Amino acid sequence: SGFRKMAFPSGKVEGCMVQVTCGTTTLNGLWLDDVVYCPRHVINYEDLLIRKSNHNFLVQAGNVQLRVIGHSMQNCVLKLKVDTANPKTPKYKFVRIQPGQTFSVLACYNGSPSGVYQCAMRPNFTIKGSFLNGSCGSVGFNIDYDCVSFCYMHHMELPTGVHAGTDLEGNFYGPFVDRQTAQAAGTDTTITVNVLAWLYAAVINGDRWFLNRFTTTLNDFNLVAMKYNYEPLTQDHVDILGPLSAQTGIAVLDMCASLKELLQNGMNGRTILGSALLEDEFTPFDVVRQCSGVTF
Amino acid sequence: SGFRKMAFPSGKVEGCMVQVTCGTTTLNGLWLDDVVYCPRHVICTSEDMLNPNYEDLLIRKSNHNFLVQAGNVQLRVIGHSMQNCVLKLKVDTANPKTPKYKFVRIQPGQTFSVLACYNGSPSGVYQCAMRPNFTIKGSFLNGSCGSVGFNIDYDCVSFCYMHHMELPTGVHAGTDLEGNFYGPFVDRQTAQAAGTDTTITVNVLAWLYAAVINGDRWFLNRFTTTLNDFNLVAMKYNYEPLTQDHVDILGPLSAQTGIAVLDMCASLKELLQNGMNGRTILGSALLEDEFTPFDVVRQCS
Numbered sequence: 001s002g003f004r005k006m007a008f009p010s011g012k013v014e015g016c017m018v019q020v021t022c023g024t025t026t027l028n029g030l031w032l033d034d035v036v037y038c039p040r041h042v043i044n045y046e047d048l049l050i051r052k053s054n055h056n057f058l059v060q061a062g063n064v065q066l067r068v069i070g071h072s073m074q075n076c077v078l079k080l081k082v083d084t085a086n087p088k089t090p091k092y093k094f095v096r097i098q099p100g101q102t103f104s105v106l107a108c109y110n111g112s113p114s115g116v117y118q119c120a121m122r123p124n125f126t127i128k129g130s131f132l133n134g135s136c137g138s139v140g141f142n143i144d145y146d147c148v149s150f151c152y153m154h155h156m157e158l159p160t161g162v163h164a165g166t167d168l169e170g171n172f173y174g175p176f177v178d179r180q181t182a183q184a185a186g187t188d189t190t191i192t193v194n195v196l197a198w199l200y201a202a203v204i205n206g207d208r209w210f211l212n213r214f215t216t217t218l219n220d221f222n223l224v225a226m227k228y229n230y231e232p233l234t235q236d237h238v239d240i241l242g243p244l245s246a247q248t249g250i251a252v253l254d255m256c257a258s259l260k261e262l263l264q265n266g267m268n269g270r271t272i273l274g275s276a277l278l279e280d281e282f283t284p285f286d287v288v289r290q291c292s293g294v295t296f
Numbered sequence: 297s298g299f300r301k302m303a304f305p306s307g308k309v310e311g312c313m314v315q316v317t318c319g320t321t322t323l324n325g326l327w328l329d330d331v332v333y334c335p336r337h338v339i340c341t342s343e344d345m346l347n348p349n350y351e352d353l354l355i356r357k358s359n360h361n362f363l364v365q366a367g368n369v370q371l372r373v374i375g376h377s378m379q380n381c382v383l384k385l386k387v388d389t390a391n392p393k394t395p396k397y398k399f400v401r402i403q404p405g406q407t408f409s410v411l412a413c414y415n416g417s418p419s420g421v422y423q424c425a426m427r428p429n430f431t432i433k434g435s436f437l438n439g440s441c442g443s444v445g446f447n448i449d450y451d452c453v454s455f456c457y458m459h460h461m462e463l464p465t466g467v468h469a470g471t472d473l474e475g476n477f478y479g480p481f482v483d484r485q486t487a488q489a490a491g492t493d494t495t496i497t498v499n500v501l502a503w504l505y506a507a508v509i510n511g512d513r514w515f516l517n518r519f520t521t522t523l524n525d526f527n528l529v530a531m532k533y534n535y536e537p538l539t540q541d542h543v544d545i546l547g548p549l550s551a552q553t554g555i556a557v558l559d560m561c562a563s564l565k566e567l568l569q570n571g572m573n574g575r576t577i578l579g580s581a582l583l584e585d586e587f588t589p590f591d592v593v594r595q596c597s
């Protein structure tokens with residue numbers, strides 16, 4: 001029993017964090033094999049990059065300075081070729097995630113990991129993270145068996161306090177640029193499939209007060225969900241929620257009628273899993289993983 | 297900007313997780329130097345649990361009865377001793393991944409990270425607090441026994457908790473790394489219920505200061521209060537008494553924000569009376585009590 005916001009064990013990623021300094025700027029880098037990946041703003045970017053030489057980039061892995069032997073740019077990420085391959089390089093992949101998907105963030109300052117938290121790619125492509133100056137280059141990941149899938153690299157904080165970044169191939173999530181200009185996060189929406197998964201986690205944990213005898217059509221639910229700035233629920237989401245529906249005996253459209261009532265009437269002084277708001281940062285897979293105990 | 301429930305990087309603890317099997321029971325152990333620490337109930341059967349005589353059960357065990365597995369390598373047990381409710385299994389190999397560590401016993405209200413493990417394999421990390429009733433609101437399934445709670449301070453891991461059991465309400469009970477249980481709990485399947493839980497007042501105040509540091513001032517008011525009047529109100533909402541130690545501990549945050557502790561106490565009194573009126577504080581509709589004054593300072597600066 002118990003439902004916590006749980007991050008993946010960060011160990012395989014900690015062994016990859018390095019500090020990258022160029023000029024007056026110090027930020028974090030991800031050392032995988034003989035390459036260090038970091039935000040290109042550490043330095044027209046190709047014009048500024050041409051002016052740089054290998055020895056301008058100081059890379060520090062703990063108390064050992066790594067020597068840069070090459071540099072290239074891929075979209076908004078700078079790839080610093082180093083002479084030493086990271087012996088702690090885990091089995092990894094670079095994956096691009098979709099909005100609504102969750103991942104763990106290993107927040108780092110000066111190439112030193114300081115915290116790990118779980119978060120979701122918001123539908124507006126920002127992440128509601130926890131970062132301070134020096135956190136740039138901190139990464140987002142998921143762990144599947146023994147494979148670390150790197151999905152995010154922190155690049156900036158938007159004026160509202162939310163964060164924007166790229167996948168490990170340097171492509172930004174969202175309509176952002178790594179430049180000094182007026183940029184704002186779009187209006188955010190609630191990740192509907194995630195709230196439903198969290199309602200199933202609540203049922204698995206013995207919280208049934210919000211359940212009702214009613215069901216709804218997918219279309220009537222979407223008409224209501226659109227009113228409360230909830231993401232449309234697709235047939236794929238309904239299919240993805242299948243296992244939780246089978247385990248609890250509550251059909252997805254049955255749980256949708258519960259969600260509809262919660263949106264129209266509120267919680268009435270009641271909580272669900274210790275929360276007075278509907279939580280949307282647990283995917284259906286996170287709920288199954290935490291209410292089954294999959295290990296890494 | 298931003299305020300998240302943040303756990304410590306779990307790497308230094310992952311390299312210490314081992315699987316301990318005794319008969320039909322399999323749970324987690326903490327391999328530090330040449331010793332594996334685990335709950336002593338690993339020697340019990342489900343029947344033995346009502347009234348186990350641990351010394352009687354342990355005297356009947358030999359080293360080879362304990363199977364210890366570190367990844368895909370079986371460790372050889374060369375000795376065993378019991379210290380309170382923890383079993384210490386001496387092994388023939390020192391863990392090369394042993395970090396700089398200490399065993400610390402924490403007080404209620406203190407927070408720590410939990411590396412939840414099953415079969416000696418870490419599956420997740422979360423942050424939580426020692427509740428005033430000495431339980432932890434964790435996320436544990438069967439096989440998580442021996443999962444540890446820790447803090448990391450200057451490359452040093454301070455182990456403060458080892459998971460032992462789940463109480464009937466869904467909350468968890470366990471010991472420090474010297475085998476002493478937190479609270480009045482025993483590693484016996486007897487009628488044990490967690491006492492009525494209260495809100496960690498000093499932590500809610502710290503979280504209100506984190507909100508002010510992050511630009512959220514809507515809940516502040518022109519009032520101040522005496523420490524005694526605040527405690528009389530706080531008791532009525534099942535909030536822990538705020539001591540002069542708590543007021544002193546909140547000093548740095550009071551100096552940084554310019555809001556005196558008793559001034560913030562008056563805001564808390566008003567929040568308790570009014571509720572949030574559809575508003576949130578740091579993305580939360582409830583008053584958060586699992587961030588200590590030390591966590592707020594570490595995360596916001």
Ligand SMILES: CC(C)N1CCO[C@@H](C(=O)N[C@@](C)(C(=O)Nc2cncc3ccccc23)c2ccc(Cl)c(Cl)c2)C1
Pocket residue numbers: 001337342345436437438439440441460461462468482483484485486
């Ligand atoms: C009902 C009874 C016939 N049996 C069925 C088989 O499992 C028995 C059981 O609960 N075992 C543990 C290991 C336990 O509670 N550990 C766990 C730790 N964390 C989360 C848990 C979530 C679900 C289940 C167990 C959890 C136990 C039991 C009694 C004591 Cl006194 C102690 Cl110290 C530890 C209860």
